[PDB]
Design a protein around this ligand. Structure first.
Ligand SMILES: Nc1ncnc2c1ncn2[C@@H]1O[C@H](COP(=O)(O)OP(=O)(O)O)[C@@H](O)[C@H]1O
Ligand SMILES: Nc1ncnc2c1ncn2[C@@H]1O[C@H](COP(=O)(O)OS(=O)(=O)O)[C@@H](O)[C@H]1O
Ligand SMILES: Nc1ncnc2c1ncn2[C@@H]1O[C@H](COP(=O)(O)OS(=O)(=O)O)[C@@H](O)[C@H]1O
Ligand SMILES: Nc1ncnc2c1ncn2[C@@H]1O[C@H](COP(=O)(O)OS(=O)(=O)O)[C@@H](O)[C@H]1O
Lengths: 590, 562
């Protein structure tokens, strides 16, 4: 005979044996058939073979030779309990839906199963007798108030409530979804139904009431000193932008992320950039062995990494796979090229909440804070715009036209998340303080509407990885509640440092994003290149036959205009926003 | 109530509704118990949910308040037939093992099934008031053939009535034009512009033609190229593993000349060998391609070096391959397509196929992996595991042992019986070798998945090589296996990963290496083998079969004469 654990490998797609019996009981019309039908549908929609035993299939076949003549009812239940045990033994979730009114017959069904090592879940579908008669779903209670039916349970014979059911469904105070969810959650607690990977925000901050204690704990551990870009990835993790990571990636997660751009355990989750912690040979041999250590930034213990695992940082290969180049003068690759040769994964418990105390912490909303803000503005669509640059009206055009399309589709309260990145950025980019001041101005001028625009700062370092990075950009906003993700040309790219051509082809970011796995709850809203049209005196989308109508105004052209004291053409950038830049460009030359 | 067709889709790893009842009847207890156990084993070995009702789970449970009166026995068999119905309706193959002596009773059990549109198979376990069935679907003579032959007869019947798939490997899409359309297609090819291709490109034309890259319809179009480089899979219409670009390159000159055209012919050695239809041209970004496929852009990597010499366009399209690819070098007999391999495995009556990709001479370390896989399968209840020894035959780097010499070596290894020729199919995989480690190992695996392998063996540093700059392992040696074991899109086969095997001095054989015995282990590389041949030494006894080593000294001698 084949073992259960072998039957578990071939019953269904998900591995592991999960045979068991979900035993529904309660009065006629309490809700058993309704629950079973819906529970079955849930299990099947999730790849879990199940079979339902009910009146339709038992009392009309196996049990056609029994009535409700209280011996018959014992024998009913007994035969059902035996069948159920055989389904459960075969590896199915067996759901049984019978009134099953005797406490002794149900316990017997329970012992038939516990005796052969099969889980048994007694679910009391509990509606007051008067409610069940209200529903009289099949016309039986009236057929029995008239006499014409037996000792119908609840009226003429007894129903004995279960004493310690695994779950009581109060079907007069909850809906069917409430029932299904309570049962499914039971089966998840008891390892019959797996908990699939989720994008539900998962912070890695310790709770405030556990915080003091965790700090004291942290103080006893070895420590590892981290730097600022590390502390900003500490923040990305803490706040949940890399949900469902539990900490810095372990080997397995790292390799998934680099080869497939996804995490794969428990379901496909897009996560296309390594979120890792590096260490030197020296730190590894020092910390390896220890079940916990603390991470220290600017002499403060900012987090604890528990159950840590050390694996090699193969850096040329990492770089080549993440960036499509191993060019040493790419500014992030250069940082990676200086780090250690080990990476460290583990479970990260972050302590004090991360504040940078620079005048900008009011913008640094967590994904929870952001979803609250949308809820409070009552948005019915959130479009997100990642940017790392001053907003010119070419960007504003992508934002305005996405806003138009949402309206045209029926949304009535579209909100724009204007989402500049504020983590590490390469040397020649405009500093965050300045870009925030510049977008404030675009908004003060009404190029974008302040009453429908949330402005906040995305804490991730920037990688400048093009079509790899953009997925990361997008998935982060997805976690924070965005339903539409605006993407133009060359997102996340830059010039190749050696050749000066674009590192990445300009349509790939979008093409890749639109077909990347894991990006299921948001729609990609992609755009062609916009540039200053000279005829119409505004930004518009570039067209082939009019190469000459269009001026492209580089970041180098702006630095140049500001310095020769001129102005970009009219329609390129909100005048006040422009001024902030001149102000920026002024302190730059020094 | 969820439908059969939907329960069907989730019951097994395989899909299709295949609920039914195999109803054994007859006197012989051992007959029925032996067959039903063995059927059960076979179904489970083959991914089909089943459940056996017999004395041991019915007698003392469901039918325990029944005794031997004629009514009680009638009822005994009624209750079993109803319960079997429930398992068949639930999508399981329900196997019933009771004497069930009377026609009335078996006829009723059938009717419970046929009246709910569930197949019922009355299998008469016949071995000399039992009432023999008048029209059973199978007569099993258990006294006169073995259990495995019986179980085969059942399995055949279940194949015939579409319960057990004839197949269930991934369906192969060949790109060859069917032979009835050839001469025509050859004529049509003659009217079109032509693009001359080289030998490596012709190898990939073969890879495509024969179906190894199923479901591509030809050289990769942009979207597929981007899926393959970013995600290691094709995604459109289902995730399947494909981690290496399968592409045709072109110069600026050739692109200009051909972009515009709706079909052109591929030309190898003056012969038109294919038409590419509805072509699209997209950039060959070499540096990025390289970096993402190989995890390095090292200009001296030998396949990277060829990609860097190719043109800056790629051409995707629908590929129709004309004459069968034959190389006329004395090895064509081993060049089996996925279709011919699947037929070869059927003809051998395999019930498990383990595939071993390789590019090197087989030492007894490799054989050990193969031998261990073959043991693991025996134990899991497979009874005719067949090994596909599948040397790669496409382009390989300059210092590798040539295909012909390897084939003759491999032939020596089977002649010494380190591998059994009777359970072993030797064939040549036609792909070029990329030397891309964990990225390429997925290509190696998927291609064999398409050829119907069920288990795919992988050891240390698969598809790797020394980094040409440092001589250090270009790849981390455990990665291939770690990546492969978790890679998406390879759901119809099992990966069997192995730790590194090396020569044990103390045991005088190849065994798995152990940290705390470092010293007993001798690692003999290709370099060391060539050094040893050149001084007239043999490697230790147990490392390589003698006749196979002698083939190698012949090879190393030929090198020396040059
Ligand atoms: N939360 C609930 N769970 C199940 N049924 C509910 C619930 N709330 C209201 N109902 C209604 O009560 C009725 C219960 O009917 P039925 O499932 O067939 O009961 P039973 O199988 O217990 O005889 C249905 O019409 C159902 O829609
Ligand atoms: N005597 C009765 N008491 C309760 N239900 C009855 C009775 N007679 C017929 N029925 C109907 O038979 C159906 C199935 O009852 P069961 O769940 O199988 O009862 S049980 O108590 O023996 O578990 C119910 O919808 C029920 O209304
Ligand atoms: N002028 C352009 N036309 C269309 N889209 C653009 C243009 N410039 C930038 N984008 C898009 O605007 C967004 C942000 O631009 P950037 O801030 O420069 O860099 S990125 O690193 O955030 O993309 C991305 O979607 C990017 O493709
Ligand atoms: N000594 C060894 N021990 C374990 N695995 C090995 C050893 N040598 C090679 N392998 C594995 O054997 C297979 C064939 O290896 P090779 O022919 O050297 O090269 S490969 O390119 O085809 O993988 C691969 O799965 C590889 O990982």
């Amino acid at each position: 005979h084949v073992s259960r654990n072998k039957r578990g490998q071939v019953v269904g797609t998900r591995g592991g044996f999960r045979g068991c019996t979900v035993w529904l009981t309660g009065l006629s019309g309490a809700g058993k058939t309704t629950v079973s039908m819906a529970l079955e549908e849930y299990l099947v929609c999730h790849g879990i073979p199940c079979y339902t035993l009910d009146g339709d299939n038992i009392r009309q076949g196996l049990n056609k030779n029994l009535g409700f003549s209280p011996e018959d009812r014992e024998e009913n239940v007994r035969r059902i309990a035996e069948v159920a045990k055989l389904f459960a033994d075969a590896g199915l979730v067996c759901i049984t839906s019978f009134i099953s009114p005797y406490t002794q017959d149900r316990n017997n069904a329970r012992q038939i199963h516990e005796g052969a090592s099969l889980p048994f879940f007694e679910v009391f579908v509990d509606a007051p007798l008067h409610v069940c008669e209200q529903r009289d779903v099949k016309g039986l209670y009236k057929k029995a108030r008239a006499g014409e039916i037996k000792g119908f349970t609840g009226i003429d014979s007894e129903y004995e409530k279960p004493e310690a059911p695994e779950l009581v469904l109060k079907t007069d105070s909850c809906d069917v979804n409430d029932c299904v969810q309570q049962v499914v959650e039971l089966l998840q607690e008891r390892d019959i139904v797996p908990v699939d990977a989720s994008y539900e925000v998962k912070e890695l901050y310790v709770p405030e009431n556990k915080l003091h204690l965790a700090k004291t704990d942290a103080e006893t551990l070895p420590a590892l000193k981290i730097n600022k870009v590390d502390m900003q990835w500490v923040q990305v993790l803490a706040e949940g932008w890399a949900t469902p990571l539990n900490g810095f990636m372990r080997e397995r997660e790292y390799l998934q992320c680099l080869h497939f751009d996804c995490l794969l355990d428990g379901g496909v989750i897009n996560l296309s950039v390594p979120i890792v912690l590096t260490a030197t040979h020296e730190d590894k041999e020092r910390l390896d062995g220890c079940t916990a250590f603390a991470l220290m930034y600017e002499g403060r213990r900012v987090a604890i990494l528990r159950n840590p695992e050390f694996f090699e940082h193969r850096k040329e290969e990492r770089c080549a796979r993440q960036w499509g180049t191993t060019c040493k003068n790419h500014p992030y690759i250069k940082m990676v090229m200086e780090q250690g040769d080990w990476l460290i994964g583990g479970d990260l418990q972050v302590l004090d909440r991360v504040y940078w105390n620079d005048g900008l912490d009011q913008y640094r909303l967590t994904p929870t804070e952001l979803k609250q803000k949308f809820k409070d503005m009552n948005a019915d669509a959130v479009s997100a715009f990642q940017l790392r640059n001053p907003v010119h009206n070419g960007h504003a055009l992508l934002m305005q036209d996405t806003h138009k399309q949402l309206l045209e589709r029926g949304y009535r309260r579209p909100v724009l998340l204007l989402h500049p990145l504020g983590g590490w950025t390469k040397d020649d980019d405009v500093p965050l303080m300045w870009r925030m001041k510049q977008h404030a101005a675009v908004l003060e001028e009404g190029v974008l509407n302040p009453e429908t625009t949330v402005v906040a700062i995305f804490p991730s370092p920037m990688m400048y990885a093009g079509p790899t990075e953009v997925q990361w950009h997008c998935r982060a906003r997805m976690v924070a509640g965005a339903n539409f993700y605006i993407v133009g040309r060359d997102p996340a790219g830059m010039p190749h440092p050696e050749t000066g051509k674009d590192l990445y082809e300009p349509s790939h970011g979008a093409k890749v994003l639109t077909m990347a796995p894991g990006l299921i709850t948001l729609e990609i809203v992609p755009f062609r290149v916009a540039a200053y049209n000279k005829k119409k005196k505004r930004m518009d989308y570039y067209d082939s036959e009019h190469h000459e109508d269009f001026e492209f105004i580089s970041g180098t052209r702006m630095r140049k205009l500001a310095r020769e004291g001129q102005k970009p053409p009219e329609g390129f950038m909100a005048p006040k926003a422009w001024t902030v830049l001149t102000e920026y460009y002024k302190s730059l030359e020094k």
